[PDB]
Every structure is written in C-alpha cells, then in structure tokens.
RNA sequence: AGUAAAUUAAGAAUAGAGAGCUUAAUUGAAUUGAGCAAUGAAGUACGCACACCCGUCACCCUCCUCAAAUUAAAUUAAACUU
C-alpha cells in the first residue's frame, strides 16, 4: 500500500497559462478547486471574493 | 466525537388536531484515573452447607421404673414317738 499522493496532472489554459484542478469533501459540502501556478493570493469561491 | 449541546427542516398518521414520534441537515465542544474499588466475565484460592442444627421450657396421651409401709394373694421341708 503506497502512502503517497497521487499528484494531479499541469493543464493549460486558453491564455497558456498552468493551472490543475482537485476536487474536495467535507461533510456535505463539495468543492472543485482550479489553483493557477502563478498569481498575486487572488481567491474567487463561486465567483465572489 | 461529527458525539453531547444548540439550531433547523421534512415525514408518518387526520377533514382538522402533539410541546409526541421518525428521519435529514447545520454549528460544534469539555473530559477520559496516584481510588475511595460496584457489578458482569476469566483465573485463583478459600466459606458454606443442603439437594432447595441443637438446648430449654408450652398443653396433649402413654408405657416404664423405683417407691413408704400396709393389705394380702398365695406357699413349703417335713420331722418326730411307741
Ligand atoms: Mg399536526
């Protein structure tokens, strides 16, 4: 049994930009992260600050 | 331990009727042993006495024995003289 994560793969966007995606659970709640690998902190959660 | 707590929603059953019941969700803890030891099991030893006691005195009836003398009921060797 390997205890190591399974590294997601590095996407592109239209811009060329990189960026990957994961998706969590916690309770009921889901949610479907798009972490981009350059950026200024600028988190958006269903398209609000 | 997503537990307690708190806050919500729905459902069953009714024509209507619960502060009840069932189910779902949200927020979300504190504590878990230097005893003073309660049960249930395991092991361990011992305690108990039955198969779930004696003593005295209480009324009851019976045989038994001794027992004071009394009253008797009855018994028994027979010898001896000419
Ligand atoms: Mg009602």
Same mark, same amino acid.
């Given at each position: 049994? +390997?205890?190591? !994560?399974?590294?997601?793969? %590095? !996407?592109? $966007?239209? !811009?060329?930009? =990189?960026? @990957? #995606? +994961?998706? *969590?659970?916690?309770? +009921? =709640? #889901? =949610?479907?992260? %798009?972490?981009?690998? &350059? *950026? @200024?902190?600028?988190? &958006? %959660?269903?398209? %609000? $600050?």
């Amino acid at each position: 049994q +390997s205890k190591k !994560q399974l590294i997601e793969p %590095v !996407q592109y $966007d239209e !811009q060329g930009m =990189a960026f @990957s #995606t +994961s998706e *969590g659970r916690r309770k +009921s =709640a #889901t =949610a479907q992260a %798009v972490v981009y690998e &350059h *950026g @200024s902190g600028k988190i &958006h %959660v269903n398209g %609000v $600050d």
